Design a protein around this ligand. Structure first.
Ligand code: ADP
Ligand code: ADP
Ligand code: BTN
Ligand code: BTN
Lengths: 235, 235
């Protein structure tokens, strides 16, 4: 009844009225690649750095099960697929979202979506949380708040899954393709504070072929930031 | 993201772009009571007498896993649950459907839906096929054909599942209540040809509290038909 016409992602969709975390269900479960897990609300939603992710009724909280057959050196680019997909969908609904390295999607610097990619063996779980009609913490925003009107959840879901399937199909063919889309939708050219192994500032210049963020230190020297236990803040 | 608020039926929904039959997946699968299986299309959909059920894109093809804890003598009333739920849903979409004993729903004598209940012990599978926006065989009808425009499948789904959940809870509380709803929406008072173990005609007078159809033969005697390998045709 959902009417999806995708090739890999969304061939099957499992919906729960309530769940602890769609990412956790994807990890403890054995499901076919492309299967989408979605819930009206999550009681224990979480983000990167393992922080709480508010998941009230009205938002889009989903997880996608994947087993990407691509070189291990390319797998890290998977986190960008989710962010680009959200940006393309936002565009379809007249919203201009930008990517905050490495997984956040902001609108006028307000967080409207987050991406959480987790790995368990050869399985990869791509989790996406997008604010649509739900209330959000102060500082954040939603599609409803941006458009000043509710937006049918199914339509957004349909749009996002369709974009992700296309992006994924291309990813399997050539993992490098996603890079040009990320670069052209990412927030760069501004000064940022990085909290990884230590602490330093600089301009978010660009990301490289591996997906690492290129920071141009004031000393004209550079520092590459890898995805993981890292925090980025705009100064 | 479907936003169902049901207590039992629809706490979980599994969707497939394509499937052989939702009724077959609902059986051969371990699933919690209330779980709903739905697909855009079925390649091997079938009905009551094992005839093919055309399931193209545009209609609602679903199956519900159930394990009602009620006396075995009231289980046969389960098939009426689906038929009444469809009638109540059609009412909500300004359509006047009536029940053709024991599982069909007609609009001006044209079949708009069929109900197929299958058992496997304690586990019961309630299957429903409702023509919405799909092309239908000659003689049949659909919500689109009745209304003059397409009807959002999700809205019909939400409506049907919500009605089925309410009816099911009342059913577990008192299996007899569904009968008055059936009588009030079933086609009665007309002559029908019955094809069960033999062949006879008569007026479809009413149904008894077991769910058996009361046929009053021309002689003056009445004959009772139980759900099973029986066919009914309006004369
Ligand atoms: N739905 C949401 N949208 C944007 N940011 C959120 C959301 N839920 C939580 N956050 C923020 O992200 C991180 C949390 O510590 C919180 O400040
Ligand atoms: N989708 C459907 N809607 C209504 N009647 C159907 C459908 N598929 C099959 N039938 C009927 O059931 C039997 C067929 O001969 C046909 O008349
Ligand atoms: O911004 C982040 O740090 C990532 C947030 C990811 C949120 C989604 S909601 C669907 C899925 N289930 C979870 O518990 N997290 C992800
Ligand atoms: O009219 C009948 O005789 C019963 C038709 C039942 C059709 C539904 S479609 C969903 C489910 N899957 C099937 O194969 N049959 C039922």
């Amino acid at each position: 009844m959902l009417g999806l016409k995708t090739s890999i992602i969304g061939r099957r969709v499992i919906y729960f009225q309530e769940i602890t975390s769609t990412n956790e269900f994807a990890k403890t479960s054995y499901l076919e690649e492309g299967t989408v897990i979605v819930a009206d609300k999550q009681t224990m939603g979480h983000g990167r750095l393992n922080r709480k992710w508010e998941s009230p009724e009205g938002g889009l909280w989903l997880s996608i099960v994947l087993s990407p057959k691509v070189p291990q050196k390319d797998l890290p680019k998977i986190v960008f697929l989710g962010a680009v997909g959200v940006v393309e969908t936002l565009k379809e609904f007249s919203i201009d979202g930008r990517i905050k390295w490495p997984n956040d999607v902001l609108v006028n610097y307000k967080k409207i979506a987050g991406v959480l990619v987790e790995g368990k063996g050869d399985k990869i779980v791509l989790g996406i949380g997008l604010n649509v009609n739900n209330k959000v913490p102060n500082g954040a925003t939603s599609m409803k708040l941006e458009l000043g009107s509710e937006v049918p959840l199914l339509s957004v879901f349909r749009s996002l899954i369709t974009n992700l399937d296309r992006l994924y199909l291309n990813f399997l063919k050539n993992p490098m393709d996603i890079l040009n889309l990320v670069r052209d939708n990412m927030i760069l050219g501004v000064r940022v504070k990085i909290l990884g192994d230590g602490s330093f500032e600089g301009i978010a210049e660009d990301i490289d072929d591996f997906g690492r963020l290129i920071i141009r230190l004031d000393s004209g020297e550079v520092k590459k930031v890898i995805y993981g236990d890292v925090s980025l803040r705009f100064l």
